[PDB]
Amino acid sequence: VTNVGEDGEPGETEPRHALSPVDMHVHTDVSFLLDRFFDVETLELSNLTGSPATHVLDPFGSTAQLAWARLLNTCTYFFSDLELSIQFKFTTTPSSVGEGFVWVKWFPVGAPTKTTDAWQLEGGGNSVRIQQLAVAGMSPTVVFKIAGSRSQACGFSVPYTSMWRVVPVFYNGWGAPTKEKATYNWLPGAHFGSILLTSDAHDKGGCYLRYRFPRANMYCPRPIPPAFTRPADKTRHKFPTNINKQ
C-alpha cells in the first residue's frame, strides 16, 4: 500500500489468508510477566551490634540484563505492590551457625533510621543484643532460623508505600532544591521501602533478595534496549538454543 509517512503513525499491508491468532498475545501482558519472584540484588546481613546500612528496595536501576531489568525501563512510570523472599546461601561450612535468627524488618517509604542498640536478651550470663529498630512492632518483622531449616528463607506482601501517585523511573529535573549532581534522576523516594537484616550470622552467608511485582501498572512507553551487539550485516545472530542443529 502507498504510504504517506512522516506523520508518525506506522502503516500496514495485510496479506491473503491473514493467519489465525492462538496464544492470544497473553504472554506479553505487563502485569502478568512481572508477577514472578525474580532474583534481583544480593547483600550481606548485619551483626546485631553497631550501626546499620538500611537497605532500600529500589528495583528501577537495571544494568545486568536478566530480562527483568529491561522490562521495568520499557515504561516511564510504574506502580505495583511488592512481595519479597530472602533466602541466604551459606558461604562456608553450613554447620557453624547452630541457630541464626534473622531479624528481617521491612520499613515503608519515609520511616526513620538511626539504629544503635537498645534491646538485650538476659539469660544466665552473656546476654545478646538486638538492633533497636530491628525488634518487633509497627513495621513487620520475620524471625527465621538458619539451622536445619529446609529453606533458610521467608517471604511476604509489601503494598505500595511511596507518596507519588505513581513511580517515575527516569526523572528529568532533580530531587531536592539543591540542584546537585546525584539528585538528577533521584527524586525523593521513587521506591518500595527498606529492609534491615540482623542475625548472629552476617558472615557465613548472603541472601538473594527477590521481588514479586503484583498489580504492575505501566505508563508511558519507552524504547526497549537491544541487549545484544550487532552481528555481521545481511545475516543471523546464532545463540545455542533448545532447538539449534545438533
Binding site: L19, S20, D29
Partner: protein, 226 residues
C-alpha cells in the same frame, strides 16, 4: 479432631512462578489515584502501533543511484535476530521470550530531493535457494513495485508461511524453524534528478511495524551477553 494431611516430597522448596502470592504483612494501605495517560497492559500492543528503524549498514536507510539496476538494494534473513532487525523495538522486545508467529510490515520512506524520482522493487524470497542476486532472479517470487513521486513512502507486508505454528525469536544454524527467508528491495529503475549535479543520491527509510497477526509467546531469561 486434627485434620490428616501428607506433604508432597517437594514440599519445603522454592518455586519462582507459583500461581499464588505470599503472606500480607502490611495491610489496609489505600493507594492514591493516577492521572497519567499513555498507559499500557500489553507489550505486543506498543510494537504493533509503532515502527522502528531497521539498522542497515549503521544507518536506517539504503541509497538509490542512477547507476544501479541489477544488484540487490537491501537483503536480510527474516529472523528476529538478523542484522537489520536487531535494533528495532519489535526485535528487542522479542528477546524476553522464545517464540513469535507473525508477518511483519515495512515502510519505505523515500527522502530524496523533491526533484527526484526513483520508481523501484521489493521482494520476499521464501527459504530454498542461496539468495537470488538480480531482480531477474528475484522477480519470479513475491514482489511489489513502487514509484516515488507523489506517494512519499510505501508499505510491504512480509507474511508468515511455514509448517510450524511458532518460530524462533532467536536465530541459529540453518533450521527449518529459524529462517523464514529474506527480504529484498531492488532498483527496478535507476534514480533520476533535475541535474545529476545537485542530486546525486536519494535515500529511503526502512521502518518496521509489527504485523497484524504477530505475537510473542513464552518468556525466557536472558542468556549471556554476546
Amino acid at each position: 479432631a486434627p485434620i490428616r494431611v501428607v506433604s508432597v516430597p517437594e514440599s519445603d522448596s522454592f518455586m519462582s512462578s507459583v500461581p499464588d502470592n505470599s503472606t500480607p504483612l502490611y495491610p489496609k494501605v489505600v493507594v492514591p489515584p493516577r492521572q497519567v495517560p499513555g498507559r499500557f497492559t500489553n507489550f505486543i500492543d506498543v510494537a504493533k502501533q509503532t515502527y522502528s528503524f531497521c539498522s542497515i549498514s549503521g544507518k536506517p536507510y539504503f541509497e538509490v543511484t542512477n547507476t544501479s539496476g541489477d544488484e540487490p538494494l537491501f537483503q536480510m534473513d527474516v529472523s528476529l535476530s538478523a542484522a537489520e532487525l536487531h535494533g528495532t523495538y519489535v526485535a528487542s522486545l522479542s528477546s524476553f521470550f522464545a517464540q513469535y508467529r507473525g508477518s511483519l510490515n515495512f515502510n519505505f520512506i523515500f527522502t530524496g530531493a523533491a526533484a527526484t524520482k526513483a520508481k523501484f522493487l521489493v521482494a520476499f524470497v521464501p527459504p530454498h535457494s542461496a539468495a537470488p542476486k538480480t531482480r531477474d532472479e528475484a522477480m519470479a517470487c513475491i514482489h511489489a513495485v513502487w514509484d516515488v513521486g507523489l506517494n512519499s513512502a510505501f508499505s510491504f507486508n512480509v507474511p508468515y508461511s511455514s509448517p510450524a505454528d511458532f518460530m524462533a525469536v532467536y536465530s541459529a544454524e540453518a533450521t527449518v524453524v529459524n529462517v523464514s527467508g529474506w527480504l529484498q528491495v531492488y532498483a527496478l529503475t535507476a534514480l533520476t534528478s533535475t541535474d545529476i549535479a545537485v542530486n546525486s543520491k536519494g535515500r529511503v527509510l526502512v521502518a518496521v511495524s509489527a504485523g497484524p497477526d504477530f505475537s510473542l509467546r513464552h518468556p525466557v531469561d536472558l542468556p549471556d551477553k554476546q
